[PDB]
DNA sequence: ATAAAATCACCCGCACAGATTTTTTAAAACGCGCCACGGGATTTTTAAACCGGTATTTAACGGTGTATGAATCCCGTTTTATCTTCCTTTCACTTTCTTTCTCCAGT
């Protein structure tokens, strides 16, 4: 209801492996067809 | 190299609150002087003590029915004891400027 236990072990693997997977699949990594990053492609 | 979140100076007019800065004014002070007042030595008069006596006026005493003084419990007020601090100060160190001493190539 208004308050549930939770342990802190799966809030912090859950917010990390979110937080990693994202900035490894949408941020810093090029494609290797065109070389570009979502930013580049998004201003062309 | 992509993301998340932040910070400061000045220009132009106008109205007002607060902080210096002159300017004026009433109190305190100084010097000189004179006459109002108090001391000393006589006259005069009256306030209060003393004898009466009488005629009131007060305070001590015995019942009822309260209003308040000491005790307890709190909370804002002011004192006092107790921490940190920025400017003064020198001072050994470092840095930076000024003069001097050679080198030294050229003729």
């Given at each position: 209801r208004?308050?549930?236990?939770?342990?802190?072990?799966?809030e912090?693997?859950?917010?990390?492996?979110?937080?990693?997977?994202?900035?490894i699949v949408?941020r810093?990594?090029?494609?290797?067809?065109?070389?570009?990053?979502?930013?580049?492609?998004?201003?062309?």
């Amino acid at each position: 209801r208004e308050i549930t236990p939770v342990n802190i072990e799966e809030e912090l693997k859950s917010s990390y492996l979110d937080y990693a997977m994202s900035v490894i699949v949408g941020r810093a990594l090029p494609d290797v067809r065109d070389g570009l990053k979502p930013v580049h492609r998004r201003v062309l």
